[PDB]
Amino acid sequence: HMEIQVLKAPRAVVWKDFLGVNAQFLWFSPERYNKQIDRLQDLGLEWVRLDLHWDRLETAEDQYQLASLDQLVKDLEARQLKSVFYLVGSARFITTAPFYSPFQDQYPPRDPEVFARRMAMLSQRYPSVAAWQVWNEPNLIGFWRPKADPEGYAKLLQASTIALRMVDPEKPVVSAGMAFFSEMPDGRTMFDALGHLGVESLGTIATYHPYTQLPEGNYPWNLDFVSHANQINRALRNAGVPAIWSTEWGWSAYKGPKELQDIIGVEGQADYVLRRLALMSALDYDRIFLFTLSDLDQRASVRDRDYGLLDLDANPKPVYLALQRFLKVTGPKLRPADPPVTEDLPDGSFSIGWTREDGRNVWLFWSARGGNVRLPKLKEATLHDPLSGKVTPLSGSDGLEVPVKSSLQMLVWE
Ligand SMILES: [Cl-]
Known part of the structure; x- marks a missing residue:
């Protein structure tokens, strides 16, 4: 028996255009995140993806906390970075959460139009931002309680798309990065359910977050990442999406205790990231974003602290040095x-x-x-x-x- 997976990309890849990174700049001082950006630029890259949580930006109705974000947006343009921001979570005044729930922000808003007006405000405030992304992983309970709701997310996406296009009709609108391959607990996929709701008529960019245990699948005897990616990407093209991104993928170097991901350490992280990059850059993605640029402090979960290309001091980890060598060999x-x-x-x-x-x-x-x-x-x-x-x-x-x-x-x- 002899099984070999050959890949040939559908188009040329320009790394500066194709490969971005997630980042968490507001977790850091401007001095520290400018050093992170130094390292990113040394890789020949420029695209970054940043999270915005509504409950952190608007801490009470029409009471905002934007000083740090305002400065970051100025800093990003001063460093010639291209950015995509996503807004996720409900502010307290608008959440559908029951009164005594511990996860108020993990419920969707009562009124999609209120959320949409905030995305419009942000876009109008920050015209340098390259793209705006609507919510995050709505197929996952931790981002949309109490149950995945394709209809609800479609209405939120529709309302946001209209509002964002009123501010700037030419700027891309990105739908939420779906967790994994968009599977929901009821056994359907979010992409499928949204297709039935006619969501492709919105013309938003489709994206998902295909984390797996190994670079090529979840088990050594079932390396079917390529097969899954091809299947979902083909289905998305057939529905006529303007583009397909993968806005998150990657591995943590954490030492444990094990939580979802097997322990692989800094050398495993370097190995797996490089193999997955070779795969994804040869598949039908228009742009992908590695998770993530830097290690994080103890505000993050144990696993989430160690996804960085960079350590806390913004210095290269083994995965950075490996990726750097890789990109030097390929050229741009x-x-x-x-x-x-x-x-x-x-x-x-x-x-x-x-x-x-x-x-x-x-x-x-x-x-x-x-x-x-x-x-x-x-x-x-x-x-x-x-x-x-x-x-x-x-x-x-x-x-x-x-x-x-x-x-x-x-x-x-x-
Ligand atoms: Cl060359």
Whole structure:
């Protein structure tokens, strides 16, 4: 038996355009988040995604707390960043929460038009913002209590879209990032239910947050990330969405105790992020956003503290250094191509081909069982290991011997 997953991207990828990061800048002093941005810019990236919680911005009806946000928006433009902001949660005066609920903000608003007016206010206040995103993970109980409500979310999205387009009719409106592949507890998907409600007529950008245990799936015997992503992306294109983003994905380096995600540490984080990036950049996404730019302090849950590219001091973690090496090897723009001819590529291999700007080919590959592969048509190539930083010239009189790892390697060849 021999199963190999080959991917070829549907279009060229320009990293500056394609790969953004989530960030939590308001958790930090301006000095600290400007250093985070220094690091982001050093990767050649510019897109950021930022969360806004309504209950934190409007702490009582028409009592706002905007000084920090005002300054951040000025700072983002001064650093030439392109930003997408999402607004989520109900302010206390508008929530559908029962009086004695402990999670007041996790209920949707009583009146969608009130929420919509706030998104319009924010957009009008901050014209530099590139896109506005409406709520977050409404298929997940923790963001929309007491039960997922496609009809309710559609009305909220409709009302927000109309209001945002009144402020600026040309600016993109992004629907909420759906948790995972948009599955709801009742066994339907939010994307499907919204399709029945005619939501595609709104023309909003569709997005979801396909976290999985491993880079290619949830179990070693069921690596079906690619299959799921292709299926949902095809369905979205068929419904005529203007674009598909993935606004969250990634892994935490936390040490435990285990909560949903297996413990993999800083080296596992580097490994998994790189493999998933190789996959997603070759799938039908227009833009994706890694979670997240920086580690967070103890205001975050134990797991959520360690998703960063950067540690708390805004210094590179292993995943940053690995991603940096990766992007240096690819260069800033990749065009779709085929992998080289192989002999005895190991079962379970992933295999992705690109061409860079200087015309050299780039092959991305790995397999859970490791091993070795022969490339009969090549006499010279250069092998890159972005996790270790090792660079290895390969040569042969009539073909190359290439070691295969469980982690991503990059072969540059012509
Ligand atoms: Cl290049």
